[PDB]
Design a protein around this ligand. Sequence first.
Ligand SMILES: [Mn+2]
Ligand SMILES: [Mn+2]
Lengths: 379, 21
Amino acid sequence: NENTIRILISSDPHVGYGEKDPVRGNDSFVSFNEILEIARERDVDMILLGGDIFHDNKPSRKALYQALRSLRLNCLGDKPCELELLSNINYLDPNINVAIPVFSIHGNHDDRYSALDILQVTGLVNYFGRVPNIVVSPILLQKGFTKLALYGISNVRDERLYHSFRENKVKFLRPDLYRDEWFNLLTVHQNHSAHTPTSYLPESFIQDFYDFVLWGHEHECLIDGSYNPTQKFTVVQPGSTIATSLSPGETAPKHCGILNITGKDFHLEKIRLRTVRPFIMKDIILSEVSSIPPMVENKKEVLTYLISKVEEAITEANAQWYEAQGTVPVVENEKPPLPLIRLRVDYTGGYQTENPQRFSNRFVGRVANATDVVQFYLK
Amino acid sequence: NRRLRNLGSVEYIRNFKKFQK
Ligand SMILES: [Mn+2]
Ligand SMILES: [Mn+2]
């Protein structure tokens, strides 16, 4: 639609993560490529990223090459950009045919010349929301009657930003012309909630004039979003495009989204990422497993139960992948990649265990993390 | 933290491509 700004939203691709792993080495490149491919196939007006583009502060030559190759092949082309800039931006360059402009803030992993400066200098990404006293200035875009005021705050040490907000040292700049017509979009890369009272960014701290908050840094996919009643805005945490640890947060299926803006209204469409390796986690408390009698030489029974839980997790992972592809397990069809499987086992109350590497070895050629399938702990 | 709100300050200020071949 001529009055609908269509933005592909994602965050935390971590290009280069696990590059050296023989099984997982290409995951970050394939999934960062997927995000750009979906944007092109779905004919969006622009891409908006929430930071942590590269895993390493100084990306490897392979990581940089792969990111540049994907951006060049998916973002350049004959497609006209229908976004009018009201207040340099790559699509306005007369020597580069930008079909889909990419906008990104920096995260803490992409810390004078960041890897993001390199993406910008090539004309492939618009690095915005720089934090050199913080002055948050918008990028003003128009498509028909729709007016977008895009704001960004690049990653700042959580305590430093929290103190800056407390000492009222954060300056949000608003356009005077077409005052209340602008759809206000904020992009951040901070902790959404931490044990420390100063290590995170509370939602209440964010100005209520904002309509939408794109929340980077947090890897868990919470793509459906959450409404803040006091501030009157809807926070969307798209999550990462790769699991950077085997944490419970990393298990939620990865998605990107299309944010459709018509006037001051929006429609968020969620898109399941097909290239993300399945990750299943099981949290087990042995004392809650009646089958296993406590305080006796129960290794055999502990092992039988845990082996059955890995098997169950593999079956769920394979099913999760076929679901993502819209396919069935048949000879003509591509087979799922090896899944990431993790059992967290609480062994309190008298239960014998097994060496984690010896346990993991029981699933060689069946799991992507053949070294750390199980973790035994005491509550 | 849940108490304070709207921290900092809020103040006011005053085809589309050029490629061809
Ligand atoms: Mn990250
Ligand atoms: Mn981060």
